[PDB]
Amino acid sequence: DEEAEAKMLEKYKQERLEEMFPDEVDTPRDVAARIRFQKYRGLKSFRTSPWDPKENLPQDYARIFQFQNFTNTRKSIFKEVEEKEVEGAEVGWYVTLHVSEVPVSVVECFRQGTPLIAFSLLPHEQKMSVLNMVVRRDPGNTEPVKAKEELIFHCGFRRFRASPLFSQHTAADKHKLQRFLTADMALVATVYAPITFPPASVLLFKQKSNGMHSLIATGHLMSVDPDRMVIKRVVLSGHPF
Amino acid sequence: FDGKLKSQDTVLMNLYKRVFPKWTYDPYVPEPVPWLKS
Amino acid sequence: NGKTFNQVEIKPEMIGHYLGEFSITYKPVKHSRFIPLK
Amino acid sequence: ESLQAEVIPDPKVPKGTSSYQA
Amino acid sequence: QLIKNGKKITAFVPNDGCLNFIEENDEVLVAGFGRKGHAVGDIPGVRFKVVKVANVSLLALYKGKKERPR
Amino acid sequence: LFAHAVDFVPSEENNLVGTLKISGYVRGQTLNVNRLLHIVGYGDFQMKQI
Numbered sequence: 001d002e003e004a005e006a007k008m009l010e011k012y013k014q015e016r017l018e019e020m021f022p023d024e025v026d027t028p029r030d031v032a033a034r035i036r037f038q039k040y041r042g043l044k045s046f047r048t049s050p051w052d053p054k055e056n057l058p059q060d061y062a063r064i065f066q067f068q069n070f071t072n073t074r075k076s077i078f079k080e081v082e083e084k085e086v087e088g089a090e091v092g093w094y095v096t097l098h099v100s101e102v103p104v105s106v107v108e109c110f111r112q113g114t115p116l117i118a119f120s121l122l123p124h125e126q127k128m129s130v131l132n133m134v135v136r137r138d139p140g141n142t143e144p145v146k147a148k149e150e151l152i153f154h155c156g157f158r159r160f161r162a163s164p165l166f167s168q169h170t171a172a173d174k175h176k177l178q179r180f181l182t183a184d185m186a187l188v189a190t191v192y193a194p195i196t197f198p199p200a201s202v203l204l205f206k207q208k209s210n211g212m213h214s215l216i217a218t219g220h221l222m223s224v225d226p227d228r229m230v231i232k233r234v235v236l237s238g239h240p241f
Numbered sequence: 242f243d244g245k246l247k248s249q250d251t252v253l254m255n256l257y258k259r260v261f262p263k264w265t266y267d268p269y270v271p272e273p274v275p276w277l278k279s
Numbered sequence: 280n281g282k283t284f285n286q287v288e289i290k291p292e293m294i295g296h297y298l299g300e301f302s303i304t305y306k307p308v309k310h311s312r313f314i315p316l317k
Numbered sequence: 318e319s320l321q322a323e324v325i326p327d328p329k330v331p332k333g334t335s336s337y338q339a
Numbered sequence: 340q341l342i343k344n345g346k347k348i349t350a351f352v353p354n355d356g357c358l359n360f361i362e363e364n365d366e367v368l369v370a371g372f373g374r375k376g377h378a379v380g381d382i383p384g385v386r387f388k389v390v391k392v393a394n395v396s397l398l399a400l401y402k403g404k405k406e407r408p409r
Numbered sequence: 410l411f412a413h414a415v416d417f418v419p420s421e422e423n424n425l426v427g428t429l430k431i432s433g434y435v436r437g438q439t440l441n442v443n444r445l446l447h448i449v450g451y452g453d454f455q456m457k458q459i
Contacts, residue, residue, distance in 0.1 A: 040256045063324050088441035096432040098458035104425045107417045116412040121445045126453050128323050152270055161267035186359045192264050199362045201409050211274040220362050236254035268452045286333030318443050
């Protein structure tokens with residue numbers, strides 16, 4: 001009860017802290033700086049300093065798929081669905097689908113009156129990858145959202161729950177991380193999610209305590225790649241006595 | 242430094258880390274209550 | 280020696296000597312050519 | 318027919334001497 | 340790619356912020372940049388500017404007056 | 410596709426899981442068994458018989 005309110009007021013104070021001082025972090029008193037900041041580096045420039053994308057990939061990146069060229073794969077798949085007529089059920093046919101292994105809980109939803117639809121996926125849309133999607137905050141909602149909390153995503157005929165990661169939308173090679181979704185400009189939320197070919201609409205919903213869904217952000221799917229990289233910045237302080 | 246510094250100045254140090262999102266994927270979404278005013 | 284305390288056990292052979300010379304205040308000092316290709 | 322593989326199927330110093338004089 | 344004649348033209352968007360409101364396969368209304376056929380005094384090769392996207396205007400979208408359907 | 414008539418056959422009633430028959434008009438393109446079927450509330454599956 002009150003511990004959720006205290007954590008929410010801590011979220012509000014973090015918004016005040018991270019906006020005036022952008023990414024400033026105090027020096028740890030007891031922990032050695034070489035241990036806490038071991039996997040860190042400094043760059044001379046913020047726009048033109050090179051960075052290896054293949055460097056230091058954790059165990060999570062071994063569970064997802066990769067594309068040698070996403071643009072050519074998207075063009076190849078879209079060409080063969082417009083040109084080739086695969087031998088199957090044609091449009092306008094009243095067909096019936098025998099689907100293999102579904103729970104019975106699908107059926108009682110239909111008996112209650114909830115509409116049930118289905119759609120055949122394209123090739124390589126069932127596999128896992130990293131989604132990049134552009135969002136913009138609804139003016140009608142004012143509650144701030146943090147970087148790594150659970151949110152409900154409606155992304156191209158699909159609904160799923162995941163925690164995003166907000167980064168600045170910039171034409172540069174690397175994007176600075178944004179901790180809180182500012183309600184004036186477009187940001188990018190990166191989600192471990194199934195592959196969905198663009199264009200596809202993106203809606204974000206925050207689950208209220210009383211079961212309500214409040215619309216937060218709207219936009220589209222930008223690209224499907226894990227090569228996009230997010231950089232978190234740290235400012236240390238020192239006094240020239 | 243390249244030049245003279247004022248006594249009230251405070252230098253700052255720039256560090257960068259490449260971060261990654263987490264695996265919190267859940268394909269199930271709970272059913273809403275009907276939406277109303279706040 | 281200015282940094283730490285040196286524990287020295289006084290043998291009977293150190294009678295005429297001082298105490299400062301058994302705690303040394305300094306550390307010893309401990310101190311690839313171009314060939315043209317074209 | 319494609320399968321439901323969203324995840325990859327493949328898995329000599331004395332006792333009283335200080336460290337300075339050592 | 341224009342409808343009535345099928346020709347391809349390269350059009351300019353007022354800023355990089357206004358590109359958030361445009362996705363592929365969208366219907367956009369396109370005007371000229373301003374000098375009766377000659378290019379911009381700054382950037383060569385582009386002769387046209389985008390006025391509306393999805394039957395709503397870029398000025399009302401950028402100023403938060405309207406929302407566009409997709 | 411939109412489900413017009415839905416009926417179920419359980420492979421095992423204690424397992425609560427079985428074959429589902431959904432009938433509706435094909436809408437977008439040519440629907441084929443060689444790609445998966447996604448129900449919007451229940452994830453990916455496989456059809457077997459059309």
